[PDB]
Amino acid sequence: FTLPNLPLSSLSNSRAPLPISSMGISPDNVQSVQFQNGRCTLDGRLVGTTPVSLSHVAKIRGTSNGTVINLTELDGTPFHPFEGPAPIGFPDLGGCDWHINMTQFGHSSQTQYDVDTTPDTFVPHLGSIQANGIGSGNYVGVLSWISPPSHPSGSQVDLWKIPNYGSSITEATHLAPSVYPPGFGEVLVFFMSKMPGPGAYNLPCLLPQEYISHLASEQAPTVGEAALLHYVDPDTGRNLGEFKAYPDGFLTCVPNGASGPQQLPINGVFVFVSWVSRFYQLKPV
């Protein structure tokens, strides 16, 4: 079994096309996460709206009629509600407004599309989102920057959330399931990127995008209960810390105090060591 032999700082976020700047852990008020992008099992199963390629990450495609944008997949093929909470690659950043850069095949210009994901018109699961002034036409959009949510008024930016893909929060939208810290002092490890906008926004994801393409290619025929990893400094070969990767597609470690993986340098490489028990006890970082 392998993970990419590439330093983290050379890789991308899987929730937006941004370089990885650090690893991190969630705030204490966040336990589980339910990201829809950046979801891939260790045997190569893409989950949620996750694409193989970063060229599809945090993008939209659709036709505006001036009132709504009727969404398709990125290549123009139809999207249907049975397929997921939104088309493949659709942004999954909750807790913020989006500003999406819209361009067109065969036309000049770009247009900023401002997206509040809270109103009842934002129903990407049913293939429809408000146009909010975007004129009639077919567009491809990519997430460019974010800002605080328009509703509730005065809300903070909380990128540990996902948007409401349905007409209400009680509508079933085929979300990929939540990911939980597995217990016994283990914390979920996140890969972070700086996101432009009017604040110091840091976007967490569960796996770098290049890990997703690697795993989806590798299609490991063997996956055990948990993969013991070392985070290694490439030049010296020094083991900087033990981590576990779990079959559902996430990494953990046991921090040695509040001052964790966030302290580790970001130019290391995760290396598979061996398959271990689900309850294998890690050495604190």
Next chain:
Amino acid sequence: FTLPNLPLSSLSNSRAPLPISSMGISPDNVQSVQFQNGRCTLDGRLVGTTPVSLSHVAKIRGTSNGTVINLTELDGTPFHPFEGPAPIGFPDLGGCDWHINMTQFGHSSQTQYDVDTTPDTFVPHLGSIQANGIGSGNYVGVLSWISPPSHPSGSQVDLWKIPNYGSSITEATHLAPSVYPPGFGEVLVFFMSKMPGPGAYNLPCLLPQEYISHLASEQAPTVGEAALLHYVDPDTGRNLGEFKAYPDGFLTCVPNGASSGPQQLPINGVFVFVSWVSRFYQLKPV
């Protein structure tokens, strides 16, 4: 040795962050190319301005003073002329004007940056490009759409070219070398993507980006003269055509005239390494 076990249609261009829509060949007035992005050898050596990740492809970073933008690497670290023709990831699309979307850490808004790559102020090899009205500040920019070059005046979009990175065409800028078709009668295979802008623009590259990160991770210890590949339909296992991958990081096939060839092939296939063969191994026409 391995290439990604992923269909081409799931992958990205390596010269802009765009899905692959087809394979193609160059026009018959283009033999060689000198792309600076999308360059990786079979043993994992990144060449030119090529980055490991698509998150760095066709991007810029720098500080405007209102007149010039002084460039850095994407992460803010200094760029110096000895390092290359431009910072890693810098766009390499010749034969067009660029329209770059500029954003800022800590500020609202985006700004369009219009780039004519022909004037003597466009000197990314020396770390400086004209601001063209972009106000003072630090920005990250990504290529968004393209249009015909502003100069010379009435010329067509030509994405087989690279820009002039230096003060003049005679300045040495440490370009990655040109790639030529090798023989006989093998053609260079290009991976194409649709690029937004006021025309039917198709952007060629030599390798999907995910091949680059794969090869850079793999660091193959035993590369031979040429890799014999099959382009396989995953479901049926049918070999749709024999191809060769060459050490310098490009693929070829022999089209059966103009009835079979890269453009006629479905884009949902997977390239599979078969074996190492001699440089002069003759392929069966596609």
